[PDB]
Amino acid sequence: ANGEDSSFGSFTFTVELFSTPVWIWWWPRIRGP
Amino acid sequence: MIREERLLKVLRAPHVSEKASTAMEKSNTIVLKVAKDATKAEIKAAVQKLFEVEVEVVNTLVVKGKVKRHGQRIGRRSDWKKAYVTLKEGQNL
Amino acid sequence: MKRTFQPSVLKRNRSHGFRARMATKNGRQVLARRRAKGRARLTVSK
RNA sequence: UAAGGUGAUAUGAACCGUUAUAACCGGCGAUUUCCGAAUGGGGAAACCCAGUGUGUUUCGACACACUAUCAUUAACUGAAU
RNA sequence: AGGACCGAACCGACUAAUGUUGAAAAAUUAGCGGAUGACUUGUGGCUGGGGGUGAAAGGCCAAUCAAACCGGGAGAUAGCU
RNA sequence: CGAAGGUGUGCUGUGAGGCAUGCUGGAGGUAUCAGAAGUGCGAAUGCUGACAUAAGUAACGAUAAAGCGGGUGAAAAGCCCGCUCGCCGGAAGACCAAGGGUUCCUGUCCAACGUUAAUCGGGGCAGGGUGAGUCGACCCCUAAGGCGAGGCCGAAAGGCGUAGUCGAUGGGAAACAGGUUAAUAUUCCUGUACUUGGUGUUACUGCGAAGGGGGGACGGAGAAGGCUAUGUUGGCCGGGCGACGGUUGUCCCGGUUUAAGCGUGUAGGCUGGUUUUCCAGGCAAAUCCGGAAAAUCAAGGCUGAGGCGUGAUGACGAGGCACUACGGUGCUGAAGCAACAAAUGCCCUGCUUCCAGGAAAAGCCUCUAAGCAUCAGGUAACAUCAAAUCGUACCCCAAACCGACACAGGUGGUCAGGUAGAGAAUACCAAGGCGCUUGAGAGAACUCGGGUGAAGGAACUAGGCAAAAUGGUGCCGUAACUUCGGGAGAAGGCACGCUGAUAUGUAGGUGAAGCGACUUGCUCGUGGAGCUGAAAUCAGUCGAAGAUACCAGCUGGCUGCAACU
């Protein structure tokens, strides 16, 4: 009656992918010094 | 004294809305779309000359255009100025 | 926590705005490179 | 140069023309907003604040021009002296 | 009166656990220190890379510092993998 | 009428390979012989895209807390409405800034998005909404600073800087009360207001500088007083009469408001004033200021909260009364005060002290100079006209900003109600706002965060890490040593509740009337009604316990090193 919308403004979701190098501590595991 | 050409340019269109109808019916105020660079004095003179009514005061505001999307096109509507024209006792269209 | 970007329009314009670029010849070359590359937006000015 | 047109997506509405003055293309003009060397001053580019004339005015105001710096040349007047 | 005292805001940061593909690229929770001062906070400005600035730690300078980032020389060079 | 390419099958050669035809496909491909190669991949922690594995495995974001009955729809734990139940309340409530930018309000929709469903949405998609002489911005002016004609330097490029010019985070004119939409308000409206100019007129008058003198215009800390917001109690008015013992009463429940402006001039604070004459000062000069005398009054003037009157026989108001879409709309409206206690707000940029000795200009006010002079100007009244432009929605301690996220993190200011409480600590509540975008069960180990434990009691551990413990006020008392201030809440003790009396409220504070006075009104004494209200003491009384919760020091000794903050 009112009209079913199909424009679908947000149907272009696209989406990418990213990451971040994290900080670590290997001092106690060191076999040496 | 503002020139007639200027007066013929400043008024763009009457604004139709429930707020405009209420304003006319209660406070005897007409609401217009006017040129974005029109001053209050220009609007007053233009109304008084082109509508042959008597104007009490003019209040103006600038409406910012909305950002719609035509598919995947970001697009912005243009800005426009609205005038709240208070008539003394005449009757307009 | 407090991050590095604390927005402020006045400082943005005074630091990277168009008239800031035009004030020195190095800034004018920044505009020259950006015009040559074909940037849609030359500066942060808006 | 023409029976086709009014840029497009994006069609429609509304129309226009029909040897010819519809459209279209070539030469030549007019108009050409604001910023930007920007140049009347500022400015956080595209805005704010002007002045000086010349008109007009239905007296509230309005219109239009001009006004950056430097070099050179001329005129004018011109400190200590 | 006091670089006084206790103690909220506020500014810090000694300890413990937890979290470690976290709620968070250093937090949370429980305590803890100061809290009229060598105090803290806002808004502008100013100092620039062998440079700044530092009550000092090779600290900090946009989650980057024994020498920031961006672009060029540059397809540097590498008896090495 | 079937090209390449695929996907097959056979056949053939030492091989790399070739050849044939089944299917798909739909338009190209090329024997031979020469020639040129971007000429051959399985790996380079190769590169780019697709799809796996773990794997339906972890998680689904603060443990503030929910359960019904409806509605709606195709469907509801999550949407909405109602009813109860938890949580924040100097916040989780508002109001803004910064930044964002339409998230605002409304209607549709459910794909994608929302860590679940979604009928819902800050999602999509559309439409509407931001109304100003007084609020800001712009603008007047300046600080840090930047730029800077000339200028002075510097191979160029440029640097520094005078006149200047910009530049707030700071000084410069002015509006407040009621009502308004689904969304806008000191902006709309209604009532009451104010400011700055112009232009005339009418009187009356010396006017006139980037120049002079004042002003603006200024520190910290501490002590007051005088107040007011703000509460509390009575009175008053409008109602009520009790789901179960009672309850027309010191009974219960609400309401009790009112502004800018315009007057009036006071608790304060500050300076004595008025003439006359004169000058080695203020580019020069002045009648302003600064200096020096004399005379006479010293009783003269400024500033300033609050109150009070008017504004306002107005508005608002507990409630009714109708209508009705039950959204909501209209209509009418009773009382409308006093006492006490009052801020961190005002007087107050006051006052007192201190050393560390506390911007700048403009507006502003006066003085003249060149000049102008029967003008011009100035001043007062009175009209009249103008005050443009811009921004105003919404978020704003957050799902709208900064952190990639609807991220347990950060983010400047303003307001601050009650009961306990020294308190803006803290417990519970008010206004308001929320229950944290996956839930339902079972009630394993183990993990996390808590509660409690017999006898023991640091035996644990690298080590009292962690836990437990102490805590509050009054009062008594306190060691060595000392730099005489400290140490020190040293250490150690004791008393805390309620009720009644003293006194059914005392001390104190606040203070009506009355009574006088006067230099008689925003007066002063003298009196005292009322109101608020400790600290005790003495006697009883209760529990196991009275800083009964929350909240809130563990203490003492011996030595190292750094004085300390």
Tab-separated table of N, CA, C and O (backbone and C1' of nucleotides) in Angstrom, chain F residues 500-533:
chain	number	residue	atom	x	y	z
F	500	G	P	10.628	10.812	77.569
F	500	G	O5'	10.710	11.318	79.095
F	500	G	C5'	9.693	10.866	80.019
F	500	G	C4'	10.247	10.871	81.421
F	500	G	C3'	10.740	12.215	81.961
F	500	G	O3'	9.687	13.067	82.391
F	500	G	C1'	12.242	10.483	82.559
F	501	A	P	9.778	14.637	82.113
F	501	A	O5'	10.708	15.163	83.294
F	501	A	C5'	10.174	15.366	84.615
F	501	A	C4'	11.275	15.296	85.646
F	501	A	C3'	12.185	16.517	85.727
F	501	A	O3'	11.639	17.560	86.522
F	501	A	C1'	13.501	14.559	85.709
F	502	U	P	11.454	19.003	85.880
F	502	U	O5'	12.804	19.751	86.270
F	502	U	C5'	13.314	19.704	87.615
F	502	U	C4'	14.818	19.820	87.601
F	502	U	C3'	15.377	21.004	86.830
F	502	U	O3'	15.338	22.207	87.585
F	502	U	C1'	16.624	19.047	86.327
F	503	A	P	14.627	23.498	86.971
F	503	A	O5'	13.647	22.873	85.883
F	503	A	C5'	12.575	23.645	85.315
F	503	A	C4'	12.501	23.428	83.821
F	503	A	C3'	11.927	22.085	83.369
F	503	A	O3'	11.082	22.285	82.244
F	503	A	C1'	14.061	22.392	82.421
F	504	U	P	9.631	21.614	82.198
F	504	U	O5'	9.824	20.417	81.167
F	504	U	C5'	9.744	19.046	81.592
F	504	U	C4'	9.203	18.195	80.473
F	504	U	C3'	9.286	18.821	79.090
F	504	U	O3'	10.544	18.561	78.479
F	504	U	C1'	7.099	17.979	79.457
F	505	G	P	11.230	19.681	77.568
F	505	G	O5'	12.321	20.362	78.539
F	505	G	C5'	12.075	21.709	79.011
F	505	G	C4'	13.159	22.627	78.508
F	505	G	C3'	12.709	24.055	78.171
F	505	G	O3'	13.800	24.954	78.335
F	505	G	C1'	13.437	23.009	76.224
F	506	U	P	13.538	26.529	78.455
F	506	U	O5'	14.496	26.973	79.647
F	506	U	C5'	14.634	26.169	80.829
F	506	U	C4'	16.095	25.977	81.144
F	506	U	C3'	17.055	26.853	80.359
F	506	U	O3'	17.189	28.166	80.890
F	506	U	C1'	17.859	24.628	80.403
F	507	A	P	17.364	29.409	79.895
F	507	A	O5'	18.917	29.382	79.544
F	507	A	C5'	19.912	29.481	80.578
F	507	A	C4'	21.270	29.134	80.019
F	507	A	C3'	21.677	29.902	78.768
F	507	A	O3'	22.207	31.185	79.075
F	507	A	C1'	22.116	27.604	78.450
F	508	G	P	21.515	32.497	78.474
F	508	G	O5'	21.924	32.480	76.915
F	508	G	C5'	23.322	32.598	76.559
F	508	G	C4'	23.558	31.902	75.243
F	508	G	C3'	22.808	32.470	74.036
F	508	G	O3'	23.400	33.646	73.500
F	508	G	C1'	22.575	30.135	74.057
F	509	G	P	22.517	34.968	73.344
F	509	G	O5'	22.268	35.090	71.755
F	509	G	C5'	23.280	34.586	70.851
F	509	G	C4'	22.610	33.859	69.713
F	509	G	C3'	21.406	34.560	69.080
F	509	G	O3'	21.771	35.575	68.156
F	509	G	C1'	20.886	32.292	69.464
F	510	U	P	21.168	37.047	68.316
F	510	U	O5'	19.974	37.070	67.263
F	510	U	C5'	20.058	36.335	66.029
F	510	U	C4'	18.695	35.812	65.652
F	510	U	C3'	17.563	36.817	65.764
F	510	U	O3'	17.470	37.612	64.590
F	510	U	C1'	16.906	34.763	66.745
F	511	G	P	17.532	39.205	64.699
F	511	G	O5'	16.629	39.546	65.988
F	511	G	C5'	15.524	40.473	65.839
F	511	G	C4'	14.238	39.778	66.208
F	511	G	C3'	13.374	40.480	67.262
F	511	G	O3'	12.484	41.390	66.628
F	511	G	C1'	13.764	38.243	67.927
F	512	A	P	11.786	42.571	67.459
F	512	A	O5'	10.239	42.228	67.306
F	512	A	C5'	9.750	41.716	66.054
F	512	A	C4'	8.270	41.438	66.128
F	512	A	C3'	7.410	42.532	66.746
F	512	A	O3'	7.126	43.610	65.863
F	512	A	C1'	6.789	40.459	67.664
F	513	A	P	7.289	45.116	66.379
F	513	A	O5'	6.167	45.239	67.505
F	513	A	C5'	4.791	45.472	67.156
F	513	A	C4'	3.883	44.989	68.261
F	513	A	C3'	3.659	45.966	69.408
F	513	A	O3'	2.643	46.921	69.130
F	513	A	C1'	4.174	43.839	70.289
F	514	G	P	2.981	48.486	69.186
F	514	G	O5'	3.167	48.797	70.758
F	514	G	C5'	2.043	48.610	71.653
F	514	G	C4'	2.564	48.349	73.043
F	514	G	C3'	3.407	49.467	73.662
F	514	G	O3'	2.620	50.473	74.285
F	514	G	C1'	4.531	47.407	73.914
F	515	C	P	2.728	51.989	73.788
F	515	C	O5'	3.608	52.685	74.919
F	515	C	C5'	3.693	52.136	76.247
F	515	C	C4'	5.111	52.238	76.751
F	515	C	C3'	5.846	53.505	76.351
F	515	C	O3'	5.538	54.577	77.234
F	515	C	C1'	7.249	51.616	76.022
F	516	G	P	5.002	55.962	76.645
F	516	G	O5'	6.061	56.328	75.484
F	516	G	C5'	6.681	57.636	75.495
F	516	G	C4'	8.104	57.513	75.981
F	516	G	C3'	9.169	58.208	75.127
F	516	G	O3'	9.329	59.579	75.470
F	516	G	C1'	9.797	55.971	75.452
F	517	A	P	8.985	60.711	74.395
F	517	A	O5'	10.410	61.336	74.061
F	517	A	C5'	11.478	61.291	75.024
F	517	A	C4'	12.764	60.892	74.346
F	517	A	C3'	13.030	61.553	72.999
F	517	A	O3'	13.595	62.853	73.116
F	517	A	C1'	13.433	59.232	72.828
F	518	C	P	12.782	64.127	72.585
F	518	C	O5'	13.546	64.520	71.243
F	518	C	C5'	14.981	64.624	71.204
F	518	C	C4'	15.515	63.914	69.984
F	518	C	C3'	15.028	64.450	68.649
F	518	C	O3'	15.816	65.552	68.223
F	518	C	C1'	14.910	62.076	68.666
F	519	U	P	15.161	66.711	67.340
F	519	U	O5'	15.092	66.063	65.886
F	519	U	C5'	15.504	66.804	64.723
F	519	U	C4'	16.661	66.110	64.048
F	519	U	C3'	16.616	64.592	64.073
F	519	U	O3'	15.864	64.105	62.970
F	519	U	C1'	18.817	65.387	64.578
F	520	U	P	15.315	62.604	62.976
F	520	U	O5'	13.921	62.731	62.218
F	520	U	C5'	13.393	61.629	61.461
F	520	U	C4'	12.060	61.208	62.028
F	520	U	C3'	10.868	62.052	61.612
F	520	U	O3'	10.261	61.476	60.462
F	520	U	C1'	10.810	61.556	63.961
F	521	G	P	10.584	62.050	59.004
F	521	G	O5'	11.521	60.917	58.342
F	521	G	C5'	11.012	59.563	58.258
F	521	G	C4'	12.165	58.593	58.203
F	521	G	C3'	11.834	57.203	57.650
F	521	G	O3'	12.977	56.583	57.074
F	521	G	C1'	12.232	57.064	59.986
F	522	C	P	12.825	55.740	55.724
F	522	C	O5'	12.153	54.388	56.232
F	522	C	C5'	12.165	53.195	55.431
F	522	C	C4'	12.690	52.031	56.238
F	522	C	C3'	13.693	52.380	57.328
F	522	C	O3'	13.666	51.405	58.364
F	522	C	C1'	14.789	51.203	55.590
F	523	U	P	13.333	51.837	59.870
F	523	U	O5'	14.509	52.848	60.227
F	523	U	C5'	15.714	52.368	60.848
F	523	U	C4'	16.293	53.421	61.759
F	523	U	C3'	16.642	52.950	63.160
F	523	U	O3'	17.915	52.321	63.238
F	523	U	C1'	15.469	55.001	63.288
F	524	C	P	18.076	50.955	64.054
F	524	C	O5'	18.450	51.445	65.522
F	524	C	C5'	19.558	52.334	65.752
F	524	C	C4'	19.327	53.128	67.014
F	524	C	C3'	19.107	52.305	68.270
F	524	C	O3'	20.335	51.904	68.864
F	524	C	C1'	17.496	54.045	68.157
F	525	G	P	20.524	50.393	69.347
F	525	G	O5'	19.391	50.197	70.478
F	525	G	C5'	19.799	49.811	71.812
F	525	G	C4'	19.308	50.835	72.805
F	525	G	C3'	18.374	50.314	73.902
F	525	G	O3'	19.072	49.812	75.034
F	525	G	C1'	17.393	52.199	72.874
F	526	U	P	18.981	48.257	75.406
F	526	U	O5'	18.030	48.238	76.684
F	526	U	C5'	17.806	49.424	77.470
F	526	U	C4'	16.337	49.560	77.783
F	526	U	C3'	15.617	48.253	78.065
F	526	U	O3'	15.771	47.870	79.424
F	526	U	C1'	14.314	49.600	76.602
F	527	G	P	15.743	46.325	79.819
F	527	G	O5'	14.185	46.025	80.109
F	527	G	C5'	13.618	44.783	79.627
F	527	G	C4'	12.240	45.039	79.071
F	527	G	C3'	11.517	43.807	78.516
F	527	G	O3'	10.527	43.349	79.429
F	527	G	C1'	11.726	45.492	76.810
F	528	G	P	10.799	42.058	80.340
F	528	G	O5'	11.429	40.980	79.316
F	528	G	C5'	10.771	39.697	79.145
F	528	G	C4'	9.810	39.778	77.984
F	528	G	C3'	9.955	38.704	76.900
F	528	G	O3'	9.100	37.604	77.186
F	528	G	C1'	10.013	40.849	75.901
F	529	A	P	9.436	36.141	76.624
F	529	A	O5'	8.047	35.669	76.003
F	529	A	C5'	6.799	36.153	76.535
F	529	A	C4'	5.734	36.141	75.464
F	529	A	C3'	5.799	34.972	74.486
F	529	A	O3'	5.047	33.858	74.950
F	529	A	C1'	5.704	36.994	73.273
F	530	G	P	5.731	32.415	75.048
F	530	G	O5'	6.216	32.102	73.542
F	530	G	C5'	5.339	31.356	72.663
F	530	G	C4'	5.550	31.818	71.242
F	530	G	C3'	6.620	31.072	70.439
F	530	G	O3'	6.143	29.870	69.850
F	530	G	C1'	6.961	33.392	70.219
F	531	C	P	6.850	28.478	70.200
F	531	C	O5'	7.845	28.253	68.976
F	531	C	C5'	7.527	28.729	67.656
F	531	C	C4'	8.787	29.162	66.950
F	531	C	C3'	9.981	28.240	67.128
F	531	C	O3'	9.955	27.129	66.244
F	531	C	C1'	10.666	30.475	67.463
F	532	U	P	10.208	25.659	66.815
F	532	U	O5'	11.794	25.518	66.763
F	532	U	C5'	12.490	25.488	65.506
F	532	U	C4'	13.895	26.016	65.677
F	532	U	C3'	14.834	25.146	66.493
F	532	U	O3'	15.433	24.090	65.751
F	532	U	C1'	15.051	27.402	67.175
F	533	G	P	15.439	22.603	66.346
F	533	G	O5'	16.595	22.621	67.474
F	533	G	C5'	17.951	22.982	67.108
F	533	G	C4'	18.686	23.445	68.342
F	533	G	C3'	18.643	22.492	69.539
F	533	G	O3'	19.636	21.479	69.458
F	533	G	C1'	18.049	24.660	70.251
